[PDB]
Design a protein around this ligand. Sequence first.
Ligand SMILES: */C=C/C1=C(C)C(=O)N/C1=C\c1[nH]c(/C=C2\N=C(C[C@H]3NC(=O)C(C(*)=C)=C3C)C(C)=C2CCC(=O)O)c(CCC(=O)O)c1C
Ligand SMILES: */C=C/C1=C(C)C(=O)N/C1=C\c1[nH]c(/C=C2\N=C(C[C@H]3NC(=O)C(C(*)=C)=C3C)C(C)=C2CCC(=O)O)c(CCC(=O)O)c1C
Ligand SMILES: *[C@@H](C)[C@H]1/C(=C/C2=NC(=C\c3[nH]c(C[C@H]4NC(=O)C(C=C)=C4C)c(C)c3CCC(=O)O)/C(CCC(=O)O)=C2C)NC(=O)[C@@H]1C
Ligand SMILES: *[C@@H](C)[C@H]1/C(=C/C2=NC(=C\c3[nH]c(C[C@H]4NC(=O)C(C=C)=C4C)c(C)c3CCC(=O)O)/C(CCC(=O)O)=C2C)NC(=O)[C@@H]1C
Ligand SMILES: *[C@@H](C)[C@H]1/C(=C/C2=NC(=C\c3[nH]c(C[C@H]4NC(=O)C(C=C)=C4C)c(C)c3CCC(=O)O)/C(CCC(=O)O)=C2C)NC(=O)[C@@H]1C
Ligand SMILES: *[C@@H](C)[C@H]1/C(=C/C2=NC(=C\c3[nH]c(C[C@H]4NC(=O)C(C=C)=C4C)c(C)c3CCC(=O)O)/C(CCC(=O)O)=C2C)NC(=O)[C@@H]1C
Ligand SMILES: *[C@H](C)[C@H]1/C(=C/C2=NC(=C\c3[nH]c(C[C@H]4NC(=O)C(C=C)=C4C)c(C)c3CCC(=O)O)/C(CCC(=O)O)=C2C)NC(=O)[C@@H]1C
Ligand SMILES: *[C@H](C)[C@H]1/C(=C/C2=NC(=C\c3[nH]c(C[C@H]4NC(=O)C(C=C)=C4C)c(C)c3CCC(=O)O)/C(CCC(=O)O)=C2C)NC(=O)[C@@H]1C
Lengths: 62, 66, 177, 175
Amino acid sequence: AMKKDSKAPCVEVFDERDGCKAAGTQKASGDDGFCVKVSMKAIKMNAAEATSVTKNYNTKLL
Amino acid sequence: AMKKDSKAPCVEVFDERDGCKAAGTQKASGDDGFCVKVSMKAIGFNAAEAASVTKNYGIKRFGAKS
Amino acid sequence: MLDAFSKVITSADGKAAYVGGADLQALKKFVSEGNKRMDSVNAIVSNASCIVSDSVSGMVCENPSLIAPNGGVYTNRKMAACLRDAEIILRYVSYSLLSGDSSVLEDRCLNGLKETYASLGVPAAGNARTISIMKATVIGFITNNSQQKKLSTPAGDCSALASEVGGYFDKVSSALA
Amino acid sequence: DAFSKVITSADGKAAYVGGADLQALKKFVSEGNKRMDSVNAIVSNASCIVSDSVSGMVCENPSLIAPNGGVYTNRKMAACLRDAEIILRYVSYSLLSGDSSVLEDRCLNGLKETYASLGVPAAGNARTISIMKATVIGFITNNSQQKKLSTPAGDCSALASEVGGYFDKVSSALA
Ligand SMILES: */C=C/C1=C(C)C(=O)N/C1=C\c1[nH]c(/C=C2\N=C(C[C@H]3NC(=O)C(C(*)=C)=C3C)C(C)=C2CCC(=O)O)c(CCC(=O)O)c1C
Ligand SMILES: */C=C/C1=C(C)C(=O)N/C1=C\c1[nH]c(/C=C2\N=C(C[C@H]3NC(=O)C(C(*)=C)=C3C)C(C)=C2CCC(=O)O)c(CCC(=O)O)c1C
Ligand SMILES: *[C@@H](C)[C@H]1/C(=C/C2=NC(=C\c3[nH]c(C[C@H]4NC(=O)C(C=C)=C4C)c(C)c3CCC(=O)O)/C(CCC(=O)O)=C2C)NC(=O)[C@@H]1C
Ligand SMILES: *[C@@H](C)[C@H]1/C(=C/C2=NC(=C\c3[nH]c(C[C@H]4NC(=O)C(C=C)=C4C)c(C)c3CCC(=O)O)/C(CCC(=O)O)=C2C)NC(=O)[C@@H]1C
Ligand SMILES: *[C@@H](C)[C@H]1/C(=C/C2=NC(=C\c3[nH]c(C[C@H]4NC(=O)C(C=C)=C4C)c(C)c3CCC(=O)O)/C(CCC(=O)O)=C2C)NC(=O)[C@@H]1C
Ligand SMILES: *[C@@H](C)[C@H]1/C(=C/C2=NC(=C\c3[nH]c(C[C@H]4NC(=O)C(C=C)=C4C)c(C)c3CCC(=O)O)/C(CCC(=O)O)=C2C)NC(=O)[C@@H]1C
Ligand SMILES: *[C@H](C)[C@H]1/C(=C/C2=NC(=C\c3[nH]c(C[C@H]4NC(=O)C(C=C)=C4C)c(C)c3CCC(=O)O)/C(CCC(=O)O)=C2C)NC(=O)[C@@H]1C
Ligand SMILES: *[C@H](C)[C@H]1/C(=C/C2=NC(=C\c3[nH]c(C[C@H]4NC(=O)C(C=C)=C4C)c(C)c3CCC(=O)O)/C(CCC(=O)O)=C2C)NC(=O)[C@@H]1C
C-alpha cells in the first residue's frame, strides 16, 4: 500500500573509472569504479522551487 | 588568509510569512516569518555537473548573450 | 546479494545500501542492458529537479486555472505538495528502471493513490499532464532529444530502455486515470 | 556578531538569526529587505550561476578543455566549478553583511599566488567572474530571461551596483 509518509527510493549512480577518489566515500566492495546507492527517504517540500514555478511557469526552457 | 580548505559561508534565507511551517524547523525566536541561516562548510566537488559542463558547454541556455 | 536494492524498500533502519564490485556486477547481469540501464537511471536522478519543475510548469501553463483560487496548485503550500508528489513518482519510476520491474512502484506508490487524490480533489487531468511531460522529458534524455542538455555517454541506441521506462510511466497514468 | 562567529568557529556549525536579532541586522545595512531578496537570488541559483559561467568560459576558449587545458579531465573541471561556487558564496556573504572584509581575508588573500603556482589561468578566471557578475546582476535587475525573482516589483539598481563591486574586488585580486 501507498503509506502516506512521502518516502521514496533515492538512487545515486557512481562511475569513478577516472580514478578520482574522495576521502571517506568507499562504502561498498569493488575496484572497477562502479557503485549504486539506494536509500528510502522522505521527499521534502521545496518552498523555493514552488515559489519559482508559481512565478515562472509560463516560460518555456530557453 | 585563504586557508585552502574549500570552506565558504553557506547562507540560506527563509520567508515563511504564508504561515506554512514544517515540524522541527524552528531554530530561533521570532514569529514574523523571517530567518537567515549561515554555516561554514567545505564546498564539495560535483562530478555530475563537471561531466555535464564538459559535454554541454557549447549550448547557450537561459536566453543568455553569446 | 540480489536483494541488496529491494531490502532497502522494506528496511526500518534508515540506512542506505551501497552496491559495488561483484555485487553490482551481478545485479547488472540480472537485468537487460545493465550499463545503458545505469546510464538511464543516472539520467533520471541527476536531473530530477528540472524534470519535476518543467513538468509541473507545463501542466500549469497549459491550464492556468490550476493556479487560480480554488485551483489544484493555488498557494505555495499546494504547489510544493505537487512538486513533491511528482518527484516521489519520478523516483519510484527510477527505481523500477534500476530493478527491472514495476512491483515496488505498484505496491508502495500507486496502491491507493487514486483514492487519496479523489478525496483531496487533486485533479486527474492535471496529474495526467504532469506524468506525460515527465515521461516525455525522460524519454528525451535517453533518446538524445534533449536540446538544452545531452547525456555524457558513449553514442548508441537506447530505444528499448526508453520503451521500458515509458511503460513504467504508463502504469502510473493507468492507476490514476 | 552572530554570523561573524560562524566564519571563525572551528566546526562552522549553523547559526540562525530571526525575530528581533534579524530585524536589527537588517536595520544596520541599507535596504535590508531588498538585500535579503538579493542574497536569496544568489544562493537559490548557485548551481546554475556557476554552471553557466564556467560553461561560458569554455565556449569562449574551448582549448581549456583540451589536453594540458585548465579544465581538462573531470577532476580539474570539478575543482573549477567548486572554486566558482566558493567565490560566489563569499560574494553572497558580503552582500548579506554589507562589506567585503571576509571575502578579502578568507577568499582573496593569497588566491592569486595559489593560482599562479597551479597554473590556473587568469584569463579564464576573469571570464568566469565576469559571467557570474552579469548573471547575478541579471537576476537582481529583472533581466534574467529564463527565471525571474518572486519579489514585489521595484528597483534594485543600488544593490546590483554593490554586488558588482564585490565581484570587481575578486577580479582585481586575480588580475
Ligand atoms: C542561473 C541560470 C540562469 C537562469 C535561470 C536565467 O534566467 N538566466 C540565467 C543565467 C544568465 N546568464 C547570463 C549571461 C551570460 N551567460 C553566458 C554564457 C553563455 N554564453 C555563451 O556564449 C555560452 C557558450 C555557448 C554560454 C554557456 C555569457 C557569455 C553571458 C553574458 C555575460 C556578459 O554579459 O558579459 C545572464 C545575464 C543576462 C543575460 O541573459 O545576458 C543570466 C541571468
Ligand atoms: C530537465 C530539464 C530539461 C533539460 C536540462 C533539457 O535539455 N530538456 C529538459 C526538459 C524537457 N522538456 C521536454 C518536453 C516538454 N516540456 C514541456 C513544458 C513546457 N512547455 C510549455 O508549453 C510550458 C509552459 C509555457 C513548459 C514549462 C512540455 C509541454 C513538453 C512536451 C511534452 C510532450 O511531448 O507531450 C523534453 C522532451 C523533448 C522536448 O523538447 O519536447 C525535455 C528533454
Ligand atoms: C510549509 C510546509 C512550507 C515549507 C516549510 C519548510 N521550511 C523548512 C525549513 C526551514 N525553515 C526555517 C525558517 C523558520 N524556522 C525558524 O526558526 C524561523 C524564524 C525564527 C523560521 C521563519 C528554517 C530555519 C529551516 C531549516 C531548519 C534547519 O536548518 O534545520 C522546511 C524543511 C525543508 C527540508 O528539510 O528539506 C520546510 C518543508 N515548505 C514548503 O514548501 C511549504 C510552503
Ligand atoms: C574525485 C575528487 C572526483 C569526485 C569524487 C567524489 N565521489 C563522491 C561520493 C561517492 N562516491 C561513491 C562511489 C565510490 N565509493 C565506493 O564504495 C565505490 C565502489 C565500491 C565507488 C566507485 C559513493 C558511494 C559516494 C557517496 C558516499 C556517501 O554517500 O557518503 C564525492 C562526494 C560528494 C559529496 O560529498 O557531496 C566526491 C567528491 N568528485 C569529483 O567531482 C571528482 C571528479
Ligand atoms: C542511453 C542510456 C544513452 C547511451 C548509453 C550507453 N551507455 C553505454 C555503455 C556504458 N555505460 C557505462 C556506465 C554505466 N555502467 C555502470 O555500471 C554505471 C554506474 C554504476 C554507469 C554510469 C559503462 C561501464 C558502459 C560500457 C563500457 C563503455 O562503453 O564505457 C553504451 C554503449 C553500448 C553498450 O555498452 O551497451 C551506450 C550506447 N548512449 C546514448 O546515446 C543514449 C543517450
Ligand atoms: C531586487 C532585489 C528585486 C526586488 C526586490 C524587492 N523586495 C522588496 C520588499 C520586501 N522583500 C521582503 C522579503 C525579504 N526580507 C527578509 O527579511 C527576507 C528573509 C529573511 C526576505 C526574502 C520583505 C519582507 C519586503 C518588504 C515587505 C513587502 O513589500 O513584502 C521590495 C519592495 C521595496 C522595499 O521594501 O524596499 C522590492 C522592490 N524587486 C524587484 O523587482 C527586483 C527583481
Ligand atoms: C501535482 C502533480 C498534483 C497535485 C499534488 C498534490 N498532492 C497532495 C497531497 C498528497 N499527496 C499524497 C501522495 C504522496 N504521499 C506519499 O507518501 C506518496 C508515495 C509514497 C505520494 C505519491 C498524499 C498522501 C497527500 C496528502 C498528505 C500530504 O499532503 O502529505 C496535495 C495537497 C492537497 C491538499 O491538501 O488539498 C497536492 C496539491 N495537485 C495538483 O493539482 C497536481 C495535479
Ligand atoms: C575555475 C573557474 C578555474 C580553475 C580552477 C581550479 N582550481 C583548482 C585548485 C585549487 N583552488 C583553490 C582555491 C579554493 N580553495 C579554497 O579554500 C578557496 C577559498 C576559500 C578557493 C577559492 C585551491 C587551494 C586549490 C588547490 C587545492 C585544492 O584543490 O583543494 C584546480 C585544480 C588545479 C590543478 O590541480 O592543477 C582548478 C582547475 N581552473 C580553470 O582553468 C578556471 C580558470
